[PDB]
């Protein structure tokens, strides 16, 4: 289908830089204007920047002026987004969306996954991933601690397994680091015949960990 | 800057039943305001443009008004898919998300299942031992875990994480993590998760002895 495909997050010291990119596919690229829209964590959707179809108006939300640079390649169809002088504030998903199509109309109903930015000194850590083994309904799971920054995805048979799936929220140890657990309920009677696996993949990190979770 | 301002802050509402929002700009924006759904873990969803138009594929359950300052949305036929934050955008001058308003579906009472995880033996080769207690599909939110160590209430050493409400079945679900030395974990044997919730008749405890089983 349509898509947005953004790119470029990780981990940057306060004062540093990073550059964002948003790759477009299924869609005139060159016909629509694009917005950039960041979530912090515990806040809500704030736009950020936009630049239009042709490029002839250009915005930004004022505690980002002079600091980001919104710009646009149509021949590559991607968007891209130069963040300097990286505040903790700065901190969140950053979406982007089309937002007008030229100057007839706002559209704004093609929204991208988000890529992740961390403002911090702190350095990146793989996680570990250990078995929360079972003992009608049993319970298992896959506990995924010691890592940073956010996020992990965590999955279930590659995706096949979606029912009955629970994956927490992080925690921030005391340590530093983030810890999460996903869980599933399955039938009891299924558990020496069908076999359970969660699929973690921590992206900043370069960590992709398939665990198996048998009975004790 | 243009200030949008939504309110209430948070809504808890039965299914089946009807909620209006309300959003306010600072100043006059016209008609150029839109509505966004964003339930946790997808990519906003825009519901309104134009105040009052619905969106392709938007049905005819949600609804919006207003002009210039003044704006409302009213959701009916509340389901449990519609648990989610509410935003509101002005784009008369580029574009201003007010702080949203996060909708729960008000389900009936549902009593926590709940479980015990002993930590892997993989786990304890690092040198600590996370015990971890599942209290799944309850409603509502509400709920107290305590631990016992060979009967001694533990304090300080337990993180508590709870989900998003489920957009199937409205509940959420909880977990524990007791974190503990491999060697204070093998001075105990008995390892309790304590679980009140307003749907038990008296609180729960799910147990295991260390190298049992
Ligand atoms: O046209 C769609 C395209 O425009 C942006 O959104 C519009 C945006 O305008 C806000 C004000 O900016 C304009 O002022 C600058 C004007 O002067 C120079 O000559 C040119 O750079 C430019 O034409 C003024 O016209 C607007 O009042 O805010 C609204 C967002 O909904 C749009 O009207 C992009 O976001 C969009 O891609």
């Known amino acids: 289908q349509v898509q947005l495909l953004e790119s470029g997050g990780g981990v940057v010291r306060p004062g540093g830089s990073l550059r964002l990119s948003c790759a477009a596919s299924g869609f005139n690229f060159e016909d629509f204007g694009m917005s950039w829209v960041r979530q912090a964590p515990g806040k809500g959707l704030e736009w950020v920047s936009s630049?239009?179809?042709?490029?002839?108006?250009?915005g930004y939300v004022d505690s980002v002026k002079g600091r980001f640079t919104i710009s646009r390649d149509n021949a590559k169809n991607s968007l891209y987004l130069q963040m300097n002088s990286l505040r903790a504030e700065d901190t969140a998903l950053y979406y982007c969306?089309?937002?007008?199509?030229?100057?007839?109309?706002?559209?704004?109903?093609?929204w991208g996954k988000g890529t992740t930015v961390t403002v911090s000194s702190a350095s990146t850590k793989g996680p570990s991933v250990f078995p929360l083994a079972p003992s009608g309904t049993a319970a298992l799971g896959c506990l995924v601690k010691d890592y940073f920054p956010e996020p992990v995805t965590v999955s279930w048979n590659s995706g096949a397994l979606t029912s009955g799936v629970h994956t927490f929220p992080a925690v921030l140890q005391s340590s530093g680091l983030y810890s999460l657990s996903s869980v599933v309920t399955v039938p009891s009677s299924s558990l020496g015949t069908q076999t359970y696996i969660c699929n973690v993949n921590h992206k900043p990190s370069n960590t992709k960990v398939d665990k198996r979770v048998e009975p004790k | 800057e243009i200030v949008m301002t939504q309110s209430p802050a948070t809504l808890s509402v039965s299914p089946g039943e009807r909620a209006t929002l309300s959003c306010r700009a600072s100043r006059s924006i016209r008609s150029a305001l839109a509505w966004y759904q964003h339930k946790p873990g997808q990519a906003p969803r825009l519901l309104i443009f134009?105040?009052?138009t619905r969106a392709t594929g938007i049905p005819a359950r949600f609804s919006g008004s207003g002009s210039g300052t003044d704006f409302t949305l009213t959701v009916s036929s509340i389901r449990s898919e519609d648990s989610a934050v509410y935003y509101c955008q002005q784009y008369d001058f580029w574009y201003t998300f007010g702080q949203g308003t996060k909708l729960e579906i008000k389900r009936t009472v549902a009593a926590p299942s709940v479980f015990i995880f002993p930590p892997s033996d993989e786990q304890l080769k690092s040198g600590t031992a996370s015990v971890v207690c599942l209290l799944n599909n309850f409603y509502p939110r509400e709920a107290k875990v305590q631990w016992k160590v060979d009967n001694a209430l533990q304090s300080g050493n337990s993180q508590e994480s709870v989900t998003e409400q489920d957009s199937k079945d409205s509940t959420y679900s909880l977990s524990s993590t007791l974190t503990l030395s491999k060697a204070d974990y093998e001075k105990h044997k008995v390892y309790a998760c304590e679980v009140t919730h307003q749907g038990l008749s008296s609180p729960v405890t799910k147990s295991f002895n260390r190298g049992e089983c």
């Open positions: 630049i239009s179809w042709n490029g002839a108006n250009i």
């Open positions: 134009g105040a009052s």
């Open positions: 969306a089309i937002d007008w199509y030229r100057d007839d109309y706002y559209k704004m109903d093609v």
